[PDB]
């Protein structure tokens, strides 16, 4: 049975950084050579295992995650390193098996007025435990005063969107990114 991973890759809508889409694969077969070869996605560099050996590896289940980030953020998305988005929004637990896909679909991503549907989160009390999201609209107070849960000078609203446009410098236009993880369970591996 062919897997819908190609469907997930070829998807009109990706969710923003603060809430990333997640898909799972069951009782199915996925030809990875379609990702291995040339794709409309330019970059295939990733760390999990040796990519060629993937065929003979027995694996239980597959996790699919996609989002839209910036070009420089694509550099920092890699695990084992600290960034403002990675420490606060999306953290990769080190030693994970599976790997990353990167590219720039600027043609669809860019919008004449600015595609502001994409959002990020830059205000939090502490760091983020890997593989965990906090989609909270709660008003954030940092200084001494609690603000009474209302907009104020010291406290701030943590959520705010990007600024896009059809023509822009390279590395700053939005980049659509999908990542996957591989693991083993005691159950019969349905791959």
């Amino acid at each position, epitope marked *: 049975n062919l897997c819908p991973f190609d469907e997930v890759f070829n998807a009109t809508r990706f969710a923003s950084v603060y809430a990333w889409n997640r898909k799972r694969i069951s009782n199915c077969v996925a030809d990875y050579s379609v990702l291995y070869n040339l794709a409309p996605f330019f970059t295939f560099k990733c760390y999990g295992v040796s990519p060629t050996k993937l065929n003979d590896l027995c694996f239980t289940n597959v996790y699919a995650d996609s989002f839209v980030i910036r070009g*420089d953020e694509v550099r920092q998305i890699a695990p084992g390193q*600290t*960034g*403002n988005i990675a*420490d606060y929004n999306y953290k990769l637990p080190d030693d994970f098996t599976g790997c990353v896909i990167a590219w720039n679909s600027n043609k669809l991503d860019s919008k004449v007025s600015g595609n502001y549907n994409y959002l990020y989160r*830059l205000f*939090r*009390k*502490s*760091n983020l435990k890997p593989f965990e999201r906090d989609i909270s609209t709660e008003i954030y107070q*940092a*200084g*001494n005063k609690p603000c009474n849960g209302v907009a104020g000078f*010291n406290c*701030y609203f943590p959520l*705010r969107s990007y*600024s896009f446009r059809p*023509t*822009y*410098g390279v590395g*700053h236009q939005p980049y659509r990114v999908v990542v996957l993880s591989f693991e083993l369970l005691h159950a019969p591996a349905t791959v």
Partner: single-chain antibody
Amino acid sequence: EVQLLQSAGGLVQPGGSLRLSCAASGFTVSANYMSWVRQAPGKGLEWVSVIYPGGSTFYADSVKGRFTISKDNSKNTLYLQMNSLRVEDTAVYYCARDLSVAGAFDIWGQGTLVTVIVLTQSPGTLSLSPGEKATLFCRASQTFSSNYLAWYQQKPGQAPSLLIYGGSTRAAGIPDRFSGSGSGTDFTLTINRLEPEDFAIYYCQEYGSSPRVTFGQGTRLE
């Protein structure tokens, strides 16, 4: 009425270590970002270090290492550890807080001097009698966003502050003289009327393009 106090100095001849106590009121170091910017004597001021809430910290690209910024929530005092230095390190050191979207380097202390995308300001240095409209233009290279622009006021003997944070909406204490509007890569800084405190040096500013923040050399307006 958030305020800031710190003190250091001396060291005409080399001293390996030096620690200045940035002590704050109205906010905590663990609350938000903390930043440092040093201004060389009669030269451009550049970014050196910012700590991120939760522990993470980045240092200046020009000189990796040899510094150590530590965040103390116990004292509410920020310290910046030195190992040892050489010449050209000397400059007035400012500790400041930033949020980079609705305010860029909003509140600064008073600072003191230790001792041992590019923005180019096309108009240059202008001297002019009071009562005439003036303009300033900031030139870039990577055609970045209007929302990432900031502009600053500096007066001799006064620690520099901000006037507009996003380049479109003026910050607290709006002047009906300055204005912010930009097209393409060049963002216009036009001035209506000249005041004695208005005759001063100004720096174009860019934030958020990278964790490191770049400044311009500055131009003299009077």
